[PDB]
Design a protein around this nucleic acid. Sequence first.
RNA 1: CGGAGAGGUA
DNA 2: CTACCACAACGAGCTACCTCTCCGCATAAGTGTCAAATTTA
DNA 3: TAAATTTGACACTATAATGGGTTAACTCGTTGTGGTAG
Lengths: 99, 1327, 359
Amino acid sequence: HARSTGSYSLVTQQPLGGKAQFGGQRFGEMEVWALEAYGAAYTLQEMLTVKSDDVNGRTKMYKNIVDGNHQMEPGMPESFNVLLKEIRSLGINIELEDE
Amino acid sequence: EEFDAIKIALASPDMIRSWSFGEVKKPETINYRTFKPERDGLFCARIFGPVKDYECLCGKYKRLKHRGVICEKCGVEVTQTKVRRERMGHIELASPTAHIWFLKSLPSRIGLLLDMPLRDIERVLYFESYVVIEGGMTNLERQQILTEEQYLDALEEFGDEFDAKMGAEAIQALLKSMDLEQECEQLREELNETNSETKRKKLTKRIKLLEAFVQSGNKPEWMILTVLPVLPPDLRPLVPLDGGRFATSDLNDLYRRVINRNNRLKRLLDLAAPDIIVRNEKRMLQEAVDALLDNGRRGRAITGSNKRPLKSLADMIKGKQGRFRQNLLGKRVDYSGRSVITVGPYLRLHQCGLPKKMALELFKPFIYGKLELRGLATTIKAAKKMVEREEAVVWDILDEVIREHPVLLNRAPTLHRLGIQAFEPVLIEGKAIQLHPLVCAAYNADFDGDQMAVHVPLTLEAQLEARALMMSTNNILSPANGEPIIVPSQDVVLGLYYMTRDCVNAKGEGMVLTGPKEAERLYRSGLASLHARVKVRITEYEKDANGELVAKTSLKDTTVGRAILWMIVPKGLPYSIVNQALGKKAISKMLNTCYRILGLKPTVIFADQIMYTGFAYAARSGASVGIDDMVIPEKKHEIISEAEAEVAEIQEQFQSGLVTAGERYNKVIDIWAAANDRVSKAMMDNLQTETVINRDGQEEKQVSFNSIYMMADSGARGSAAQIRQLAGMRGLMAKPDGSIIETPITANFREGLNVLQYFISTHGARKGLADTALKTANSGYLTRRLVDVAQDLVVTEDDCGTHEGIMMTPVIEGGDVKEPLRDRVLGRVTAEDVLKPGTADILVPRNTLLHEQWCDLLEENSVDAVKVRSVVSCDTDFGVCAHCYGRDLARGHIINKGEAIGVIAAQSIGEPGTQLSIKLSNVKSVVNSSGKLVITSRNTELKLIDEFGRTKESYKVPYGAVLAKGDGEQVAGGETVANWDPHTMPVITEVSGFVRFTDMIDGQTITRQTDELTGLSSLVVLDSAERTAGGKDLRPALKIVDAQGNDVLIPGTDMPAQYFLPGKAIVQLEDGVQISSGDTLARIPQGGLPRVADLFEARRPKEPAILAEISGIVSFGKETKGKRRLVITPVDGSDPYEEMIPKWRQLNVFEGERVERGDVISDGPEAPHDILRLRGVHAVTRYIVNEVQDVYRLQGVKINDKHIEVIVRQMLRKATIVNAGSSDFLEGEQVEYSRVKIANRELEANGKVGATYSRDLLGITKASLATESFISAASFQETTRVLTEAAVAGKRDELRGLKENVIVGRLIPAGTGYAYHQDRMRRRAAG
Amino acid sequence: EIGRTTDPVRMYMREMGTVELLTREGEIDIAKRIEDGINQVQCSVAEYPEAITYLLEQYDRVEAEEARLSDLITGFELAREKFAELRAQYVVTRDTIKAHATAQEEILKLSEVFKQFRLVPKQFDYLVNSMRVMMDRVRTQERLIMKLCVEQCKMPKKNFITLFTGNETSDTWFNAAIAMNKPWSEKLHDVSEEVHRALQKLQQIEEETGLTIEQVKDINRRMSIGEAKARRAKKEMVEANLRLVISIAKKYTNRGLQFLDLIQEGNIGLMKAVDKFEYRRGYKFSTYATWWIRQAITRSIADQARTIRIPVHMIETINKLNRISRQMLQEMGREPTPEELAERMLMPEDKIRKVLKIA
RNA sequence: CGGAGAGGUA
DNA sequence: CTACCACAACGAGCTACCTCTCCGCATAAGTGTCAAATTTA
DNA sequence: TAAATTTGACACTATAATGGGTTAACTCGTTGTGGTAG
Ligand SMILES: [Mg+2]
Ligand SMILES: [Zn+2]
Ligand SMILES: [Zn+2]
């Protein structure tokens, strides 16, 4: 099975999972530790933001690769904002404190 | 968007209204005649935005021309629909409730604050008992819980003076009226009078919480929930399915419950309902709220329709399937494929065979871009359809794109870091990814249907990242230990073994050759076998002092195979490497030597050539297994018959009634074990030297050419045990309860088993199969914890300039050396010099990285032990320096700054978890009358030192043990010097003469009885636990005196030589005898993975060993009770410390001698906390390293010790302050040791007193939870408690760990990104 | 005891079980107390003159036929003549405002001729809350008077209330408190202006009530005591009939709502039934209260049972369908088809209508 | 496009 | 007054992938005016 | 928009009915109460 770009979930907005529904392979916690151990920063970032649940980053990635320029423009993943909203609904104030 | 912190704090009602855009006020979600949202519903458009991009619900404004505007008809703001997942609502609760996290998550954070029991708070909350908030009269104080009857009595008595309320509102009033600063100051005053340990702990916890509130700016009333925030609708969507039915989230149900009950409460309040009615409604509102926050916390979880508990917000935050561990750390990734793997033998180390279809699908945007650039397509849709019908030009452009574009191959579970690797792709027709045979050891990958995934780097930084850091030709040596991982496996080794081995008279023996090329010519011509013993001319190149190669040519006695293999060997290696039969170890040493001598690229080419030749000649060999290859030994039947006769006669003797059943069971076990060993030895002898058919000298004998013996000897596949079970005897099997069954499985797997032996073996088979999965799960959990504890350790400095270090010594436990000095010291940097005369007076300076040459020089000069800088002793704050760590095992040189060492150490430790003259030292002894020296010290050790100075063996003698040879004597091997009574221990003295019985009389401290062994009248002391009233205040002392009677003093001090002899002693010596000096007087009796987990997380053992906390003499202080109290008074000052020992626990050191700091008083396992607090950080580091390494060596796994040292250093991050100076630290605060280090640095820089401290050894879980970053702890474990603590404390995160930046989505401060972060820091600090 | 328990149902039943059942005649005296309180408050508010002015003008404006006469009066060609005679009594009272016990005689006879007037609760509650709003207006007047009284003088309340229970309308009581020459008496001159604005303000109340402060005070006191007695009797009736609510509600469980929600809705229905129960019909309270309790419970299950709210008529039809299906399944031995349900269901319903009716 | 249950592979 | 033990409660348990089936279940009493939002020309 | 009409909402039924269903009930370490006895 293989997949380049397909459908996305609704809540977390990352690509689905499964051959029957044309999903993408999960990059689990162990593999994150491995790339961390190499010191592999850029590949880890591109597998965390622009090839995953970040809507603007992934569409920009598609547009740029179609244009031949190999560069990333990362952004804040949607799952993080999902977590922020959930924990705020818990009644505890969390916020990204600028500086 | 560019932030340096993530701030956590409590949420005030005003801020809760501030986030919201409107109040939801109705339980209906949407309409159903038309699927449009309701007004003020859970998905209302007015509050949460329009459903569609730049559209209204009525349809009035329907385009981008009105970019932003609010429709007057339906109130919806014209904005893009994404605002539907970022806008919150709010419900206005009628009766304020209590936040469940700040009420039930222990500690309560409310009862600890109001100083009330949790039960009383719950009673007031449950509307069961009244509580007074304020009262002018002294009869009713604050927080006095009254019953309903007491409330009515007070209300009819005073009625106006006091205020007594009921429910969460009363608690809110109590929190509001309370003053933080007055309570904290009065507790500061009251903390000083008396200090009971439990009381002191509760007061210090209370004062910490109060000061946290004072500093964080939060208010105590804010934990009483008044307004409920409402999640945006797109985060709890109500989505239809393909069958028309909807599939909503549980959060909608919880919100419906809460809003319905709140609305009905408002209705009843305006309706003037009776008191019981409104009380019930308030109680159900509280239950709705807490079920919303977390279902299964307070009481019974509220189940939905399918009888399962509903998923609350807390369940969507925490857990294995929560947000943190399933969507922030691990994510689903685009541009990913998956496929089954096969074997590719024609590849190189840097190539992988990618199928055409997966390659086309993965590089689709790249193919679009290159097709557009070339001009063969006008639009993106044209490229889409063109690649969809797959012309040949598409294939050519695909070949162009993939050229020099590495891809990542990944196999789960990725235990260690080599589980993901970068390979260059080669297009192949088929559907399987073709791997290289050599990389299967790193992947732990077999070709039995295993699968792996392919990822594609996109940007230039990622491509260079994969090319310079992740390429399979870079990571040759394993990071755990400095050994190559790309080794020939089970086929190349067999081919090479068949190559380099020699027969006796194979074909054309005694020949002579001009070089290897003629040997290959003869072999391929058929005039000589690969096993002929020949004379060959060899020209070998050796390395001089500098980098060039000089040549020497000579004649060697080799085989045709050795000569042929000589073509493969690069220039620079000596000929002794090839001149013997090459097993797996031999080829591993070959590759290691080639790497150490020539470098990297020649090693890669040599490995490729070795693999090619091995496969070719293994194919040409034709080695095959057959039913005749497992040759049964011809003497098995006689041995088994003799063993059966022995067991039969033993059974008959036992039935006669001579020996017990248990001893008979042990004896038959031993007999069967001996028979099994004999059978195994006979078979191994008969298989090892089968080839006796030999010629041209006589009937000669040589190593057998049997196939099974080839596969066992060469190390290709199998070992001695497998061949024993195959052709010899199966052996003894174990019962499910662990006991060994008496009768063993006699038959092997060739003769075929019967029913019962097979049935017996099934037990062991099933037990092993289950244990595999169980130990896999345990190893996974341990690896996760270890990776967490050391995730934030990165090398920052190059050299900290510290003079501390660990004293590397070869471990010599037992009768052999486990690892010599070489394996101990390779790679590390000398802390100090090597100052010893020795024989050459080697002198290496400090700050020297000990290469292989340096270690060889050390071994040649015979250095006993060296001090080296260690990670635990480094003096760098928030990271370690390069010199302290030493050498990068994966590369071979000093470590580059910015490499995360904690992750490497954790992965290395947790990866093999699925496989689990005589010299007397520290001596104080006395000479006896016979020369059999007897030692009166405990910590004395006798080592066996060579004539070269090396130490070979070591032993520990018991107290009073006898030995014949003193220090400085050179004794020959095999002499028994360790002589001692094993079961009992003597009460030896030091003064000669006669004995006078003083301070013992038969009846109250000794028992009048006669020995049952010798018949002599002996006066044995009875233990104080069974003595009468007259024996409760005296200690019986065998006061040994001179020939006349006065108590002679010990020479050296003025304390008389007396011996307070304890109870339960069979004292045999009587009066009127001669006692020498040093002689005895009486005899007194004395898994792997779980062990590693216990050591690393540091449990106190079930039977702790008691150490001496203060140096001085030892004495007993409390009487008439079996829990003896010990007064260890010092020899100079007063004693402020005592000890308590129970009854049943045995005592090693009696009350007659003196102990120093850190002496064993009672035997048993040692708790590492005590070792740390008494001996020092170095001692506990060494103890942990030795205990972990013992377990890892018993199973045969090589792990470098620096990883364990890094873990230990991360375990010692906390330091409890015993005495404060001028810093903002009161007492007993487990604050970060780096904080107090920098505080003392600055305080002494400005010239003040400073603050002392004492480090504490926490477990891995506790240390991880106590980390200064709350986000990492929340992502790890116990998310609810960590988040509550962070919220109440008003903490903030500085984003310094790797996991934090992984979560938020930035570069990790390690490797390539490290510099960037430093740059960012150097821009944040300087401006 | 009040100890280790967490189930709200258990605790609620525990406090509910401390109250004994009522007999055949206990309900009779409870209803007698309820009606006594109602009559007492009605006659207390009837004696107030501006109340009869408002009801007279309301009857005049409905005599213009702006609303049906059945809207106001619920019982006791006939309304017009009694409106005319009460108008005549009002105008003869206007002729004899202070000319003096005959004014009290005619206002009281107006009160008892108004006793037979059973009217709609909306206007009755409007009148009583108007009473309460002007009573709290004057209460705020004397409250600011008390604030002025004890904000600067630190003086005992008894002497002030003795001189404030007499006239308390003109300025001569304030000047009398001034003239007593107490050390804190002459210091009240600083607030002479503001209390004057108070004295006229209550005077305004006086001129919009036509009666003295004491008269309206005692009238509202009687209204309050009657209301308190009626509320206490209503409470005793309601909280002694909770077992009936539990018994009715236990049959509707597991249909969308929790047990305690059903109990609360039944309690609301029981409150309504107590408010509308009449004992003079000779029936037991249980029979009349059961209808209201069941109606409240079933209406509650018809609005909040499912995630999506369905109108009551549609829910009734859904049942009008469930029963039919079951009846037909029992009769034929197999589940019905849509056409058979169309045949058996209704004259206006066809296959498509009920197909739409299925969710 | 979700969640449960059952089974299978490494 | 406070050193000590036995219970109760709470939080923890490799990774990745594939296939299939299930989720408004037994229960329920109908009328009557008034407003009103969707529907034809 | 004027008018129709099927939806939607609310108010009202007068014999006596008087306390509810229920599920399922390893191993280990840490924390906090609840006495306990001398
Ligand atoms: Mg496999
Ligand atoms: Zn609209
Ligand atoms: Zn160091």
